[PDB]
Amino acid sequence: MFEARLVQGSILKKVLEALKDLINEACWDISSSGVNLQSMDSSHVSLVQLTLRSEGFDTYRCDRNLAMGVNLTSMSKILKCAGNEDIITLRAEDNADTLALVFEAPNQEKVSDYEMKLMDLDVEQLGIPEQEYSCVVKMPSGEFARICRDLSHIGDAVVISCAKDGVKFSASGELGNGNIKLSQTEEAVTIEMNEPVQLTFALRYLNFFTKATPLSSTVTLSMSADVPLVVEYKIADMGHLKYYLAPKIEDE
Amino acid sequence: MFEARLVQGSILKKVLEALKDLINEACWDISSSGVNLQSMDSSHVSLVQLTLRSEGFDTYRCDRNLAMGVNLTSMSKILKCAGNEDIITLRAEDNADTLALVFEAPNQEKVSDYEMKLMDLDVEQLGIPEQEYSCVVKMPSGEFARICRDLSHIGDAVVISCAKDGVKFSASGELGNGNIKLSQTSEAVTIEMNEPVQLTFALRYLNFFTKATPLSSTVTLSMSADVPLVVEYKIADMGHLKYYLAPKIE
Amino acid sequence: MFEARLVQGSILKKVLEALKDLINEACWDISSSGVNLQSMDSSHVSLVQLTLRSEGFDTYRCDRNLAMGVNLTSMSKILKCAGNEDIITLRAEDNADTLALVFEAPNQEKVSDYEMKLMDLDVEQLGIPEQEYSCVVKMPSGEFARICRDLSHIGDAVVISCAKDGVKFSASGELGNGNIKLSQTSEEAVTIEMNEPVQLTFALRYLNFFTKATPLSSTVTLSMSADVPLVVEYKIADMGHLKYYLAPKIE
Amino acid sequence: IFVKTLTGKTITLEVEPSDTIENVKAKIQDKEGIPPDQQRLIFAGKQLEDGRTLSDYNIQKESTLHLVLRLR
């Protein structure tokens, strides 16, 4: 028996909102320590890592480790039937050719229960022992989000540039070019660096990543020369959602 | 001449929204009793009965009985011009082939007047007559609406099962299946049954019915074994909007 | 060598909003007196006249007079990248084949910057006389927008009948017809300045094009006369104005 | 005939032996105010079935019937 009672179903619903477009089918890794999802997007470009640790839940029970094949789109389609304050529980048993999701309206008075068939998938891994980063930036999720949305009106790629004197998102296109700055600081931005850096990323995928904005009011950009950008959304003393994206070779 | 002055105009607006996507061409029966409508939808599937009683009008004058042929999407098109607070007046002169709609903005500044042509049409009646139902569920309109909408993701039909202590709506499709239980209190879902029942209905039509949600905070589901479900939306102190939908077999 | 600056940069946004649909590439003539633009729409139908006087700009410098060919849709895309709260600054150099727009958040830190490339302009100036009008109506913009939008469902054209008691907007189609009567008073305050009565038929299409200017002012003014183009006015407060010209239907 | 709840109280009524359970239940709510749904009737240790008549099983006059109500 795997069963997890999560009080805020919103977190789940959102998580799938931040996934379904980037990933179609995935195998959640459900163990004692928590629920993991590690998958390349359907174009094999960006790496996605979701960790929900047993702690952040309220009820967490996993007997035998199991691997749930599921279509994130279907699952999201199910979670759309859940209210935002609805307490949500996932329950699958052993063999588990299907999964059950129960939504309790708060105050109760209403209970909804669905089950979706599962798919036989295998695994992911994609471990990434990682490292310290020559640069890291904590900033409002929404801000970064619209930085991306707007600059995607100029170039098809943004150049992020980092020194403790601020941060700069530049882009250029047939329309001409534009350059955003920040300048440091409850909110806004911090920077931590052992070294300044400049990299070039595709706004398409970043704009995918910003779909997780509703999770944390803060996002974290981690980058080092010759290391993929890791954009970071913290989930509620629960887990985290990481997006890995390889920088362009010539900025420039 | 026929004239109906109605001070809360929203209602008419709302009524039309609850109709146009279901009924196409319809004939309003106009009598001293009030304005009535009974018609089969575009597809000859669902039944609709609208009742607006003369009493419920602030002014009601009918000097004879007439059958107004009209396209509901045209009347709706027109009504969208009316404001929400607008006093809507409705005037069909003696034997004219057209219809007048006057939207009087409250505060007496803007006053708008429209006239839409009518069609040569018939009445066709179709009274049920009436009966008592095993189960009668009284439930929030918004809830019924949400249930129909959410299930329609999952399947094309809904099984509604009414038992003394609660009500369940279920559906199944390729994606999986789902069930939603109400659980009577103990607004405020209410069950009156001399008997339990469970029936299957086409979800698209329920979703058509739920267009009447704005007309009231409370919807009524009335059915019994082997007999059309009845969705009822109460038009306050005025009349009612009722949809009849035959259940699936099995 | 010019830089103007507008806190309440929001205006620029809306200015481009009321425009980009109606006209694609235009030439902003900018003197030492202020920023100005006038152009026909893309179909050679409607006339458009915008003036932002340097009076409103918190800072203005124009050395040598400029004529800036620009694509309004693109400039619109660049404006979208500024906040409504944002204070804006427009900057060009002599010839200036490129215009630098700069966005400052009233939030201080977080300032953006852009360069949009310009175009080689044609030669354009209009014939607007600034004459006296038989009827001048003054109403809230939202209401005119409602009226135009609503009559669009009824028919192609809207007859504006203007008299001293008020103004009535009529329309027709294969549904039937409609009429909307406004009145006087008693922001706010609809008015009629009348000399001779007028009855003029206009095309709801271009009027609905005009109504996109509504976010600019709480009120619109309709200057009308017979056998002369309708004049629809939205007015930037403490700044300047925006005006539209549309020929009535003939006969 | 007598009808006693579990409370140990019978009460008097007039029915015609060789009759139906239902009309009896109706007599019961007349005074008591109980819907014939909310109620059930037990005599001779067995539940009395709806629609049957007494003469099926054997009964004479002056007989205490146990009135036992259905679930809340």
From Swiss-Prot, chain C:
Keywords: Acetylation, Deafness, Disease variant, Disulfide bond, DNA damage, DNA repair, DNA replication, DNA-binding, Dwarfism, Host-virus interaction, Isopeptide bond, Methylation, Neurodegeneration, Nucleus, Phosphoprotein, Ubl conjugation. Residues 7-100 are annotated as: Interaction with NUDT15. Changing M40A: Complete loss of interaction with UHRF2. GO terms for biological process: base-excision repair, gap-filling; cellular response to hydrogen peroxide; cellular response to UV; cellular response to xenobiotic stimulus; chromatin organization; epithelial cell differentiation; estrous cycle; heart development. The keyword Disulfide bond applies. Residues 61-80 bind DNA. Changing I128A: Complete loss of interaction with UHRF2. Its main location: nucleus. There is a cross-link at K164 (Glycyl lysine isopeptide (Lys-Gly) (interchain with G-Cter in ubiquitin)). The keyword Magnesium does not apply. Changing Y206F: Alters chromatin-associated PCNA stability and its function in DNA replication and repair. Changing S223I: In ATLD2; a hypomorphic mutation affecting DNA repair in response to UV; results in significantly decreased interaction with FEN1, LIG1 and ERCC5. GO terms for cellular component: centrosome; chromatin; chromosome, telomeric region; cyclin-dependent protein kinase holoenzyme complex; extracellular exosome; male germ cell nucleus; nuclear body; nuclear lamina. One of its GO terms (molecular function) is MutLalpha complex binding. InterPro entries: DNA_clamp_sf (IPR046938), Pr_cel_nuc_antig (IPR000730), Pr_cel_nuc_antig_C (IPR022649), Pr_cel_nuc_antig_CS (IPR022659), Pr_cel_nuc_antig_N (IPR022648). It is found in: Nucleus. The modification N6-acetyllysine is found at K14, K77, K80, K243. Auxiliary protein of DNA polymerase delta and epsilon, is involved in the control of eukaryotic DNA replication by increasing the polymerase's processibility during elongation of the leading strand. Induces a robust stimulatory effect on the 3'-5' exonuclease and 3'-phosphodiesterase, but not apurinic-apyrimidinic (AP) endonuclease, APEX2 activities. Has to be loaded onto DNA in order to be able to stimulate APEX2. Homotrimer. Interacts with p300/EP300; the interaction occurs on chromatin in UV-irradiated damaged cells. Interacts with CREBBP (via transactivation domain and C-terminus); the interaction occurs on chromatin in UV-irradiated damaged cells. Directly interacts with POLD1, POLD3 and POLD4 subunits of the DNA polymerase delta complex, POLD3 being the major interacting partner; the interaction with POLD3 is inhibited by CDKN1A/p21(CIP1). Forms a complex with activator 1 heteropentamer in the presence of ATP. Interacts with EXO1, POLH, POLK, DNMT1, ERCC5, FEN1, CDC6 and POLDIP2. (Microbial infection) Interacts with herpes virus 8 protein LANA1. NCBIfam families: pcna (TIGR00590). Antibodies against PCNA are present in sera from patients with systemic lupus erythematosus. This is Proliferating cell nuclear antigen. The gene is PCNA.
Curated annotation (Swiss-Prot), chain D:
Phosphorylated at Ser-63 by PINK1 during mitophagy. Phosphorylated ubiquitin specifically binds and activates parkin (PRKN), triggering mitophagy. Phosphorylation does not affect E1-mediated E2 charging of ubiquitin but affects discharging of E2 enzymes to form polyubiquitin chains. It also affects deubiquitination by deubiquitinase enzymes such as USP30. Mono-ADP-ribosylated at the C-terminus by PARP9, a component of the PPAR9-DTX3L complex. ADP-ribosylation requires processing by E1 and E2 enzymes and prevents ubiquitin conjugation to substrates such as histones. The record marks R52, R70 as: Interacts with activating enzyme. It is found in: Cytoplasm; Nucleus. It comes from the Eukaryota. Changing H66G: Loss of DTX3L-mediated polyubiquitination of histone H3 and H4. The record marks H66 as: Essential for function. Changing R70G: No effect on ADP-ribosylation. The modification (Microbial infection) ADP-ribosylthreonine is found at T64. There is a cross-link at K4, K9, K25, K27, K31, K46, K61 (Glycyl lysine isopeptide (Lys-Gly) (interchain with G-Cter in ubiquitin)). This is Ubiquitin. The gene is RPS27A.
